[PDB]
Amino acid sequence: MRHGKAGRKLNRNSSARVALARAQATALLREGRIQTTLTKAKELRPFVEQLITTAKGGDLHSRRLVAQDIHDKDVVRKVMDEVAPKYAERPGGYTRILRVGTRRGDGVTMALIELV
């Protein structure tokens, strides 16, 4: 049974679940938009949304919080001093997804997730 849910196991253990959502947040932040499986995108959406909301605070604490997950110093810098400040007057919804059909090899359906 499962009448309350944090998201997905994907098909991975606690350690990986994390390492993935971290890496994919890092790439969407470095890259503005990326396409991946529709699932992994839906799973990415709130992690990265909350991450930008953390960095939106400006003080050293929020930067060190972001450093906890985005372990590449330049992406954290960009999110801190570039992207979050831009999202200043935006109350969430930093992120959007749109779906782009189906893949050849596994016949899986990819989609794009991009900064708003």
Binding site: L98, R99, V100, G101
Partner: protein
């Protein structure tokens, strides 16, 4: 050998009997409003890349 095993070979009729359920569903394709090609719903028109505006290359 193989604990459970089947008893008599199944009939040409009953075998196609079970299969009355494997027909594929055709996509509900629709006409893209800008590229004048066909596209899956709630996805991005592959031909022109458009999705109200235009997101993907080519």
């Amino acid at each position: 050998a193989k604990h459970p095993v089947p008893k008599k070979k199944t009939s040409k009729s009953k075998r196609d009997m079970r299969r009355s359920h494997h027909a594929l569903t055709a996509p509900n394709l629709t006409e893209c409003p800008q590229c004048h090609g066909k596209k899956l719903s709630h996805h991005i028109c592959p031909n022109c890349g458009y999705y109200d505006g235009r997101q993907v290359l080519a």
